[PDB]
Amino acid sequence: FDKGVIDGITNGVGLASFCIGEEIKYVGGGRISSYLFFFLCYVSVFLF
Amino acid sequence: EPDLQEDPIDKWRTNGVSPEDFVYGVYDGHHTYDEGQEKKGFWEDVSEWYQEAEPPQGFQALISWSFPPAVILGMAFDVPGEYLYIGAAIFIVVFCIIEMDKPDKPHNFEPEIYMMERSKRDKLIADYNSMDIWDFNEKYGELWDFTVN
Amino acid sequence: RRVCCVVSGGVYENVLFFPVVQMLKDRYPGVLVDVVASARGKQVYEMCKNVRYANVYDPDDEWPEPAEYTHQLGVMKNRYYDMVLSTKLAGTGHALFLFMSSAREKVGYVYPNVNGAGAGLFLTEMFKPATTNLADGGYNMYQDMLEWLGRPAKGVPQQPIPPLRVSISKKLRAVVEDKYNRAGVEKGKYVVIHGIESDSVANMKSRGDDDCLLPLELWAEIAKEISSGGNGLRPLFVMPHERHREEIEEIVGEETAYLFITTPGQLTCLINDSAGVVATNTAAVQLANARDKPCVALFSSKEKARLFLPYVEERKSCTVVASATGKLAGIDIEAVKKAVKDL
Amino acid sequence: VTSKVAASASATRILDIPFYFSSNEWHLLLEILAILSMILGNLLAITQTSMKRMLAYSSIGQIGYVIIGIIVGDSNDGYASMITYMLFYISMNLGTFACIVLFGLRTGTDNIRDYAGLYMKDPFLALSLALCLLSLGGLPPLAGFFGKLYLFWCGWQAGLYFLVSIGLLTSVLSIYYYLKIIKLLMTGRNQEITPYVRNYRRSNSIELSMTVCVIASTIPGISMNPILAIAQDTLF
Amino acid sequence: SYFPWLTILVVLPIFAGSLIFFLPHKGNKIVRWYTISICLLEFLLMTYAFCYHFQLEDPLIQLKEDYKWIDVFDFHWRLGIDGLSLGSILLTGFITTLATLAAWPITRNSRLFYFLMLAMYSGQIGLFSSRDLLLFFIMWELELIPVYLLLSMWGGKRRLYSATKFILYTAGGSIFFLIGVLGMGLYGSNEPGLDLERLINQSYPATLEILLYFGFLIAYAVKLPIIPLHTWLPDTHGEAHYSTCMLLAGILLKMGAYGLIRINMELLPHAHYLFSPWLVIIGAIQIIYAASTSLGQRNFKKRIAYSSVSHMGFIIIGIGSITNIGLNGAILQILSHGFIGATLFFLAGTASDRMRLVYLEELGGISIPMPKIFTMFSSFSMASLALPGMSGFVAELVVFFGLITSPKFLLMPKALITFVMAIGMILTPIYLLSMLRQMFYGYKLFNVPNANFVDSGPRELFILICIFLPVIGIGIYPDFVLSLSVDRVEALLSNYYPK
Amino acid sequence: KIRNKEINNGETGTRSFVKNGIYMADIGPSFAAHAYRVRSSAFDLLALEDLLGKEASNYVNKYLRLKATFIYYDFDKLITAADPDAKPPLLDLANRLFDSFEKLQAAVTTKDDTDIGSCYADTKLILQEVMTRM
């Protein structure tokens, strides 16, 4: 309950970033049509 | 590099890393029922043990031995503190400029330069200790240039 | 370009990984290829000419504490590999461990249906079933995905690189081999026997039931006519890869002159200094068949097509005897000794 | 450098002069950008292996955050802080770009894994790159620290709280890759350094630019008194 | 007097170490002497400033001075020594000089290394002598890079993970500190605000006292290990070179206590008086938790790290339980631990590097080849056992006396907490002697070959003796470190309002 | 954070040398457990000017305060628990003592040599009499 709990937490706070970065880094990825699509979605939703 | 492997895991709290006290291959033969009487006196033993450092050699000894009997007497026939803290001040400087002006030895330098082909001698002794700023032998760029004869 | 292999398992399922490493160093020339394996497996990489330096992280436990986890990732990532090709049949949890290593091309094996079939989206070239039975077929997917897949590189670049071609450093070849040999009888004219008992000899990770050991009575019956005749006249090397100081006192292959040694997976040199070898399906088979080293393999039956593909190694030198009953501990030991007496 | 400078010069004027009334409806809007700009521009920056792309993420994807971090919180008591931070950022960015151009030309690679051992071959360039990188990190004695500081101290002094905390947190986060490349500089494991820094004939213009741009990344952070006294006279 | 001492005492090390750079002379030799001479000069100037330019009889600030630095957010060179600071300043000078000496046979770089040592020296003294809150923060974070470099260049097998965890963790912890800075800096900045002396009269409103208190307490619990915030210590201690670790676990930890004493108990009383009992409870449970997890470790470096963790509960319990002696016994405790922990890490790092075995199970009988290490190790183990005579006893005793005679308690927890605290004396030897017995006692193989096995030479032995003698000198007559008359004004504010 | 229940020792501007924040254990209301601690505390301030009478009397004003606060509080707790008759003269005694203490503290705060002893003579003469009227 020291290595398995609080060490687990103090690593998962620095480990979840290592996963989230590469996870959100592998959406889109080129294909300029996708760039423009994701650029239009935000413009459209921001109109609210 | 072979590094043979390991074996039937030992007690986590192995009482004392030792041979278990069955084959303790002598009781009282390892620590007590052992001594005789040989030699060597006292004083020729002391003044043969303070010299396995060559701790100072010359003047660097006089300023190091006559200092404590001048900074223990100082706390008597009292003299102002300013005098006492420039005395110790000028010591730490004089003793330093004599140390750093002593010759150099092979163990002083880098590891990658410690292990030469025993040409380290004429690369360091009488080669380093005979110049001031020459850097003709500036081989601290390690890729094994070795730039010497 | 840098490459990292994450091969899993012990020795017998790791010694067969040399073809993949050679195919890597052949397809992409001048590539630094490192490897991470288990403690018992890393011992094999002390005889090779391709890998830069090995490591040890994964016996692939369940818990392993989340500081030895990060630091492992913290040493894979901070050297910037390019294609971290893997084994150990990643599902959906072990795939993340490859994925967080920010390389370019993640290729590995996956579970067909069991253990959360999964295989994830964040991978590339996931393939065939898990338990990895056959030998020298082995990673059979890998010796096809790394073959001419891309470009004007010639037609499939030397399909399955020559079989195991392990090398021996002359330092280890001389000093330790000599010291252990001459501890007891030694002429470089003896015969190695490997399968004895069961602690961690090679265990092959795949044979399952047979080849783990023989009852040491068949070994005595074989050995009594091995040195019989001026053929070797040296060989009594029961070669126990065990705690055999727990076994040497019971060598009913009478302890008169039956020698014995303790070894890590370094015994390749000891094979190379023998005059042959006779063993069951184990690392000794592949090691002896790698060099010329005329071997005699005795496993259960018909598993040859799984564990021994090069039936003719050099001159059909390495010969195999099966067991009609199927269980290894029953064989025409008479015909076995007949075959052995020639070498 | 100049695209960001010109865009941030046009934005404040195009949003403050003709948009008196809509403050409460764009002050929020820009905030939604900033809170994202200093997050998505950092996470990815961790996973990078190329130098130019990592610089794109960190020095632009993020650092275009705390500049804005006062445009929302501005009663004309903050614009001085934007001017000062821009003056710091120009130098602390051109230094590292000069170092990168020089090393890339001298070797022929961009990926991070080739900067190993560069401290031993040529220590001056490694030092003048580490200085600018640490400054970008925002460490006390350097300039980026005082930049971010005076950007927060005027911006916490304007009420809004859930933007300064995120800024400090993402700065702490940004420390990571800076220290990563720094660690990759200082090393001596001869059998690790690739045969790129190994053949580096070490050695005008680029040297001059790099050396006069890097000391401006250490001195003004401590000499910001006249810069501050100058930047307060802005009414636009 | 107006001849500035503290300014010199802060700008001497880093300046006179900046000359190591741009000095092509040798590989390793001359730099060692050029650094030890500067260290000795600095220590002598420190003791000269303390002896004939200090009073011990007035609770104001001494040797103060200030200037104008940035002037926009009022932040000056304000600098001044006081009662609480003096002990830690002297201890820092002493132990850092001796650490720089212990770092003698380093030839890997030996030019960046000694310069970084001097930088850490100057930063520690700058913090311990600060008088302006923002300048206190600057000195706090100035050392963060040198320590990271010392970790990542020299020390341990897995240096990298430890170093990066340490730097990220400390930098993150300092965020709440900067939050508190921004909080109480803008609170009426026309009234000086950023002059740590003129903040004694600040009357903040409710629900803001608590936020600033917590913003400082989180950063302190980060620096000074408190139970839920201690996970970083074993990695950044079990992987650091003993030269670094001496000053690291002997000074850098105590900054988290000095700051908590100086800016929390002196500035935010009604934010600290309504939060003392939970501090006491946390320290009481820490004293036993750290030891109960120390006994479990298996490499003696981490065991020593946890033993250092444990003694940081006495400091906590002394900060709470608001008395003169409870606060005062804490200072004696930080001194008597900056001695013992530093020396124990030096001994651990010196025994190792001779045996190259880290796991406490394979350590044979090292008493046969090297006696003197065994002696000086058992002695300091006894010291860490709170054994009487040595200075590890009187500190804990005064801590007990401060808790017992506390006014903010009525006999219900004043006894149960004392009980749970005294369990530490039953618990600590169980894990100290368990190491002393596995690693030293017993007869290993016939380790007769006098190679890779040599008793401590003159330098290490003198270091051990010169750190040991103060322990005895303080534990026999502990009024060399009770030269504190600020507590008679430090605990003057709190002592009557409600509750 | 502690009050007095017989306000006659407080002279004009009711205060004294006292240093609040000193823990005095409960002894019970009785004219036997206060006339005893008052004695065994007033015994110390006799032994005060034995060694620390001269030789840098900068701790004397750090111990007189302490071992006189005990007297100041216990003497009130005592003078409460007494019959009406013995209260006037005991109070008169109290007045002369707790004024000589203020005088001694104010004189020693000046770091003198002979004034300290000359003043201590009077508090000794009176304080040797306190150990008898009990």
Side-chain angles (χ1 to χ4, degrees), chain A residues 1-10 12-48, chain B residues 1-3 6 8 13 16 19 24-25 27 29-36 40-47 49-53 55-56 58-76 78-81 83-98 100-101 103 105-111 113-120 122-126 129-135 137 140-143 145-149, chain C residues 1-3 5-12 14-21 23-37 39-47 49 51-69 71-88 90-112 116-120 122-132 134-141 143-150 152-158 160 162-176 178-185 187-200 202-204 206-210 212-230 232 234-240 242-243 245-247 249-257 259-280 282-288 290-299 301-305 307-342, chain D residues 1-37 39-64 66-69 71-105 107-167 169 171-201 204-235, chain E residues 1-25 27-28 31-73 75-108 110-119 121-126 128-131 133-190 192-208 210-229 231-234 236-266 268-314 316-349 351-367 369-393 395-443 445 448-449 451 453-454 456-485 487 489-496 498, chain F residues 1-2 4-5 7-8 10-13 16-18 20-25 28-29 31-48 53 56 59-91 94-132 134:
Chain A
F1 288 178
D2 183 76
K3 299 181 319 174
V5 168
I6 72 169
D7 209 6
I9 289 316
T10 184
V13 65
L15 188 48
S17 179
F18 272 121
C19 181
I20 280 293
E22 269 298 305
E23 160 164 321
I24 77 160
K25 206 197 144 194
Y26 270 28
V27 298
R31 275 95 167 288
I32 312 98
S33 314
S34 52
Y35 280 169
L36 281 159
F37 176 40
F38 281 101
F39 160 86
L40 207 174
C41 310
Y42 301 139
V43 167
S44 88
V45 60
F46 263 114
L47 282 198
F48 297 162
Chain B
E1 57 267 17
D3 178 37
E6 285 301 323
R13 279 93 172 97
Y24 184 94
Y27 280 150
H30 280 190
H31 55 277
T32 169
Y33 307 164
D34 186 74
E35 188 202 350
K40 263 301 295 184
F42 171 79
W43 269 116
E44 280 303 325
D45 173 45
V46 162
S47 186
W49 166 90
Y50 162 74
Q51 291 198 351
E52 283 78 1
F59 183 82
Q60 195 204 1
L62 191 146
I63 213 66
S64 178
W65 268 128
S66 177
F67 166 87
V71 190
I72 181 63
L73 188 148
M75 323 309 189
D78 192 277
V79 64
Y83 282 23
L84 195 40
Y85 279 13
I86 68 149
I90 68 175
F91 169 73
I92 205 62
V93 171
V94 172
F95 186 89
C96 188
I97 77 165
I98 305 165
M100 89 181 65
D101 286 4
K105 307 193 165 204
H107 59 82
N108 261 337
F109 299 89
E110 305 291 325
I113 204 171
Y114 188 25
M115 308 171 252
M116 296 285 104
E117 65 265 9
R118 297 321 286 203
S119 67
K120 155 182 63 171
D122 62 355
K123 181 265 172 194
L124 177 61
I125 307 312
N129 292 355
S130 280
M131 303 145 178
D132 46 0
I133 183 166
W134 69 101
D135 283 27
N137 307 62
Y140 296 94
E142 292 86 1
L143 71 160
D145 270 332
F146 75 72
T147 321
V148 77
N149 285 310
Chain C
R1 163 178 308 193
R2 308 207 192 179
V3 171
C5 306
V6 200
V7 62
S8 177
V11 171
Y12 187 88
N14 196 297
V15 65
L16 307 176
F17 198 56
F18 274 38
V20 163
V21 176
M23 190 170 304
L24 289 174
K25 205 94 173 169
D26 207 324
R27 163 84 165 105
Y28 321 113
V31 168
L32 315 173
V33 55
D34 287 299
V35 57
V36 162
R40 200 46 61 97
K42 155 205 166 196
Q43 276 297 328
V44 183
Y45 288 126
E46 268 67 11
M47 45 182 77
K49 71 196 88 152
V51 191
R52 207 171 84 212
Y53 55 78
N55 259 317
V56 53
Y57 159 68
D58 65 324
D60 306 272
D61 309 334
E62 185 272 334
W63 182 224
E65 65 95 18
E68 194 258 3
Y69 188 27
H71 154 70
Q72 186 48 53
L73 183 47
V75 75
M76 289 180 69
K77 162 176 298 275
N78 304 348
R79 52 189 60 181
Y80 313 102
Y81 287 116
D82 277 358
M83 51 181 316
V84 280
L85 59 95
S86 160
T87 63
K88 193 249 159 182
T92 194
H94 183 261
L96 276 185
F97 178 69
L98 268 298
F99 176 53
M100 269 166 277
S101 89
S102 291
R104 164 175 67 92
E105 188 176 359
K106 277 77 70 177
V107 284
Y109 276 131
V110 291
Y111 290 129
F122 38 87
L123 269 178
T124 294
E125 289 330 288
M126 68 290 291
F127 281 98
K128 80 177 302 305
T131 182
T132 319
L134 80 165
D136 264 10
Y139 318 97
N140 200 56
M141 184 271 272
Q143 302 82 347
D144 282 17
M145 204 276 296
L146 310 177
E147 282 297 279
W148 184 69
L149 77 163
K154 77 194 170 187
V156 287
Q158 215 290 316
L164 306 179
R165 271 304 319 280
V166 62
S167 160
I168 300 300
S169 159
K170 269 213 177 164
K171 188 259 184 182
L172 168 74
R173 164 135 183 180
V175 305
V176 178
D178 182 82
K179 171 61 204 95
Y180 277 137
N181 263 323
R182 279 74 197 172
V185 305
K187 206 197 175 178
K189 212 206 292 189
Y190 46 77
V191 168
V192 174
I193 314 293
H194 208 167
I196 301 305
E197 290 284 341
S198 80
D199 163 46
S200 67
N203 263 337
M204 297 82 58
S206 66
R207 196 60 212 81
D209 51 358
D210 280 332
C212 292
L213 77 163
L214 290 191
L216 205 54
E217 311 306 317
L218 308 173
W219 289 132
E221 164 57 31
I222 278 171
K224 61 162 55 55
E225 288 92 7
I226 293 324
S227 303
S228 311
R234 293 292 184 270
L236 314 178
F237 278 173
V238 72
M239 181 47 251
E242 289 279 90
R243 304 173 193 164
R245 279 84 54 81
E246 76 175 22
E247 316 190 335
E249 287 73 3
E250 58 101 25
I251 303 289
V252 297
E254 317 307 329
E255 292 92 356
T256 77
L259 272 300
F260 37 84
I261 311 97
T262 302
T263 43
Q266 84 171 58
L267 77 162
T268 308
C269 193
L270 200 146
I271 301 281
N272 203 6
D273 265 331
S274 67
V277 63
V278 176
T280 183
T282 197
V285 187
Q286 316 291 343
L287 289 155
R291 296 181 173 275
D292 177 32
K293 292 303 113 178
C295 77
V296 168
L298 310 173
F299 44 91
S301 285
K302 82 180 173 62
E303 302 258 10
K304 161 166 54 189
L307 280 298
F308 203 86
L309 301 198
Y311 71 117
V312 164
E313 186 38 59
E314 283 295 338
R315 54 93 177 171
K316 193 59 181 173
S317 201
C318 274
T319 176
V320 168
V321 176
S323 80
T325 187
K327 306 305 168 289
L328 178 62
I331 299 157
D332 187 345
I333 67 175
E334 299 76 16
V336 160
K337 176 218 64 182
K338 297 319 177 300
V340 173
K341 212 176 180 172
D342 77 331
Chain D
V1 303
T2 190
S3 66
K4 291 325 168 307
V5 167
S8 174
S10 196
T12 183
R13 194 215 289 285
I14 195 167
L15 275 190
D16 176 89
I17 291 294
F19 279 90
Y20 287 134
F21 38 88
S22 294
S23 46
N24 50 3
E25 269 286 356
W26 65 263
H27 269 169
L28 174 64
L29 172 63
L30 280 176
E31 163 169 344
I32 306 192
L33 296 201
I35 286 307
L36 298 180
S37 200
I39 292 190
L40 276 77
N42 261 315
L43 293 182
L44 315 162
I46 279 183
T47 65
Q48 279 323 291
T49 64
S50 179
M51 179 68 52
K52 298 189 301 214
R53 186 173 175 89
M54 190 200 78
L55 266 190
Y57 280 159
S58 178
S59 41
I60 303 90
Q62 170 211 311
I63 299 193
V66 66
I67 313 157
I68 290 303
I71 281 185
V72 57
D74 182 77
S75 84
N76 264 288
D77 48 336
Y79 281 155
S81 80
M82 192 158 56
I83 304 312
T84 53
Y85 188 63
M86 288 324 287
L87 189 41
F88 288 164
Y89 165 68
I90 281 167
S91 75
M92 69 208 292
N93 203 54
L94 286 185
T96 180
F97 276 100
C99 299
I100 286 309
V101 170
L102 196 41
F103 163 77
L105 275 169
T107 313
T109 175
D110 186 25
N111 42 4
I112 280 183
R113 67 197 190 202
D114 296 354
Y115 293 81
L118 195 42
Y119 175 50
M120 198 65 257
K121 281 306 293 181
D122 196 350
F124 199 105
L125 186 137
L127 198 55
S128 178
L129 168 62
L131 260 176
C132 276
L133 274 172
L134 289 189
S135 181
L136 273 192
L139 287 158
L142 309 179
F145 173 88
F146 284 72
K148 289 180 184 181
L149 177 64
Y150 187 48
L151 273 190
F152 293 153
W153 193 84
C154 177
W156 186 281
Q157 205 259 349
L160 70 160
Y161 297 130
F162 185 49
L163 193 148
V164 160
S165 88
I166 289 295
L169 186 134
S171 88
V172 157
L173 176 50
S174 67
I175 309 191
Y176 175 79
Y177 41 75
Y178 296 138
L179 272 291
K180 164 177 57 161
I181 178 57
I182 291 319
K183 146 188 69 183
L184 270 156
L185 268 69
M186 319 292 185
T187 181
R189 301 193 34 79
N190 193 0
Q191 78 101 16
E192 177 164 19
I193 51 179
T194 74
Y196 272 56
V197 69
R198 190 169 259 110
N199 312 332
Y200 182 97
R201 172 167 78 266
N204 259 340
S205 154
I206 295 169
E207 292 87 4
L208 295 201
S209 178
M210 156 190 51
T211 182
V212 310
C213 175
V214 67
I215 80 172
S217 159
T218 298
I219 301 305
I222 302 168
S223 159
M224 83 199 302
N225 203 37
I227 304 194
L228 279 179
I230 276 172
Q232 298 266 339
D233 298 354
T234 77
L235 270 302
Chain E
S1 161
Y2 65 97
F3 182 76
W5 303 91
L6 282 151
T7 314
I8 294 185
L9 263 191
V10 170
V11 312
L12 193 60
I14 187 54
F15 179 91
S18 178
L19 267 71
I20 280 178
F21 279 148
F22 313 138
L23 181 67
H25 205 273
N28 173 54
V31 192
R32 324 188 306 197
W33 293 106
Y34 172 74
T35 300
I36 200 67
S37 67
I38 283 300
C39 281
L40 270 297
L41 279 188
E42 167 90 338
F43 178 46
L44 264 188
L45 201 151
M46 281 170 55
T47 196
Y48 182 80
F50 154 67
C51 59
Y52 315 139
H53 288 337
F54 202 62
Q55 295 318 111
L56 322 175
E57 207 80 357
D58 270 323
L60 295 175
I61 320 164
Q62 300 284 331
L63 317 180
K64 82 193 61 196
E65 77 273 15
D66 44 351
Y67 298 112
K68 291 294 144 279
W69 194 257
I70 305 302
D71 201 23
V72 160
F73 54 95
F75 154 64
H76 312 143
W77 194 233
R78 187 56 208 270
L79 203 72
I81 191 180
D82 206 327
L84 302 147
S85 62
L86 165 68
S88 279
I89 297 181
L90 287 185
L91 173 55
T92 290
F94 184 73
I95 196 65
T96 309
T97 295
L98 283 175
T100 301
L101 171 57
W104 201 255
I106 287 309
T107 70
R108 186 69 253 179
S110 69
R111 302 172 106 259
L112 174 82
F113 175 58
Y114 292 153
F115 171 76
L116 276 176
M117 198 63 74
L118 276 151
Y121 197 117
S122 189
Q124 294 155 302
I125 291 185
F128 278 128
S129 65
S130 83
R131 195 39 75 159
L133 192 150
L134 197 91
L135 171 69
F136 177 89
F137 172 60
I138 294 318
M139 290 308 192
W140 172 289
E141 265 172 18
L142 175 139
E143 54 85 17
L144 185 58
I145 283 303
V147 54
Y148 173 87
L149 291 182
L150 302 157
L151 269 294
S152 202
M153 284 306 300
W154 307 273
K157 170 196 203 302
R158 48 165 210 165
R159 70 181 74 90
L160 307 178
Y161 167 84
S162 44
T164 179
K165 152 186 289 164
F166 157 75
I167 181 171
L168 280 197
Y169 183 78
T170 294
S174 88
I175 288 308
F176 299 85
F177 190 93
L178 196 42
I179 285 308
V181 182
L182 300 183
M184 71 165 61
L186 300 172
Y187 189 99
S189 159
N190 50 5
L194 261 67
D195 271 332
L196 194 56
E197 162 63 16
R198 313 193 48 179
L199 291 175
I200 310 312
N201 320 330
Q202 269 313 94
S203 309
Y204 305 103
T207 200
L208 181 137
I210 296 190
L211 303 176
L212 307 188
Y213 195 59
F214 272 55
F216 292 151
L217 167 77
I218 292 307
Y220 284 152
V222 166
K223 199 41 165 284
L224 174 147
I226 295 177
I227 308 192
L229 272 60
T231 318
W232 63 287
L233 211 62
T236 182
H237 279 179
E239 296 320 303
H241 191 199
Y242 52 83
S243 46
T244 284
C245 177
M246 277 173 61
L247 68 98
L248 196 152
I251 292 303
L252 261 59
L253 288 191
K254 303 319 179 329
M255 273 146 60
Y258 165 78
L260 203 155
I261 275 170
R262 180 169 272 287
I263 71 165
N264 276 20
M265 271 202 76
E266 189 190 0
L268 315 181
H270 40 258
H272 170 100
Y273 165 66
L274 296 199
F275 204 61
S276 316
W278 301 100
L279 262 172
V280 167
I281 299 277
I282 281 297
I285 57 184
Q286 184 186 248
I287 294 185
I288 183 182
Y289 171 82
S292 184
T293 186
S294 191
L295 177 51
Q297 292 279 24
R298 215 172 50 92
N299 48 341
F300 54 102
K301 299 188 61 82
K302 305 193 165 31
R303 206 184 273 235
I304 300 305
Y306 279 158
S307 48
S308 178
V309 174
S310 185
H311 309 334
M312 311 299 294
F314 294 132
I316 294 316
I317 299 164
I319 288 172
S321 55
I322 301 167
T323 61
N324 287 341
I325 58 171
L327 196 146
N328 206 349
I331 283 149
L332 158 61
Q333 158 74 10
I334 77 176
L335 268 75
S336 168
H337 178 232
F339 284 145
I340 297 308
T343 321
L344 264 183
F345 284 109
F346 181 41
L347 271 173
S352 159
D353 162 83
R354 287 212 184 72
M355 298 165 297
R356 314 188 185 148
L357 280 193
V358 58
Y359 286 141
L360 202 54
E361 324 286 10
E362 299 81 24
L363 278 300
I366 322 300
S367 71
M370 45 181 71
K372 301 175 205 177
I373 292 187
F374 187 26
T375 293
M376 289 317 289
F377 200 97
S378 189
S379 158
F380 276 99
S381 277
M382 291 324 195
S384 178
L385 290 183
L387 200 84
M390 298 171 172
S391 195
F393 170 53
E396 161 266 348
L397 193 49
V398 178
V399 165
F400 281 171
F401 274 10
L403 173 67
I404 284 304
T405 67
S406 178
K408 196 202 160 56
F409 286 109
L410 51 92
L411 187 57
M412 194 43 211
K414 196 189 273 278
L416 200 147
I417 287 306
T418 294
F419 176 92
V420 178
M421 210 175 314
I423 312 289
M425 300 180 328
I426 298 190
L427 199 55
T428 317
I430 301 192
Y431 78 79
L432 274 197
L433 307 154
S434 302
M435 161 182 61
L436 290 174
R437 166 189 71 105
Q438 301 209 339
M439 78 178 289
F440 273 134
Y441 295 127
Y443 184 60
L445 70 89
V448 75
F453 272 108
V454 168
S456 295
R459 178 188 38 93
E460 308 145 347
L461 191 41
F462 165 70
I463 286 186
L464 287 176
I465 286 191
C466 194
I467 303 176
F468 184 46
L469 276 190
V471 170
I472 288 171
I474 293 187
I476 283 180
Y477 177 42
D479 201 24
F480 305 113
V481 299
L482 293 195
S483 74
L484 272 297
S485 178
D487 303 354
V489 176
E490 171 68 48
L492 161 62
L493 291 73
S494 290
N495 201 4
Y496 37 90
Chain F
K1 206 177 304 163
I2 180 154
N4 212 354
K5 217 168 184 158
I7 320 297
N8 290 66
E11 53 89 22
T12 182
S16 280
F17 51 83
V18 308
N20 51 280
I22 181 65
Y23 155 79
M24 318 165 69
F31 186 22
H34 280 308
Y36 176 59
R37 208 204 274 123
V38 165
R39 173 189 208 194
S40 171
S41 193
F43 173 52
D44 312 343
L45 309 175
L46 269 297
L48 181 53
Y59 293 172
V60 187
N61 296 334
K62 203 205 268 201
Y63 178 91
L64 160 75
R65 219 186 306 273
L66 162 62
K67 284 289 185 28
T69 289
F70 287 164
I71 309 187
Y72 172 71
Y73 280 148
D74 277 358
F75 207 89
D76 296 326
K77 300 295 187 291
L78 184 149
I79 195 59
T80 43
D83 64 348
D85 191 340
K87 278 203 252 174
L90 214 43
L91 211 61
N95 299 128
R96 283 157 324 131
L97 183 69
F98 294 171
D99 166 85
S100 160
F101 283 166
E102 272 151 22
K103 177 62 76 54
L104 174 73
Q105 202 272 0
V108 180
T109 307
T110 66
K111 288 286 306 306
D112 294 331
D113 59 349
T114 185
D115 293 331
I116 301 198
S118 53
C119 174
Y120 179 86
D122 308 347
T123 181
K124 169 163 191 172
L125 176 135
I126 294 166
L127 190 63
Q128 204 155 36
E129 198 270 336
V130 164
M131 215 176 313
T132 290
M134 54 89 72

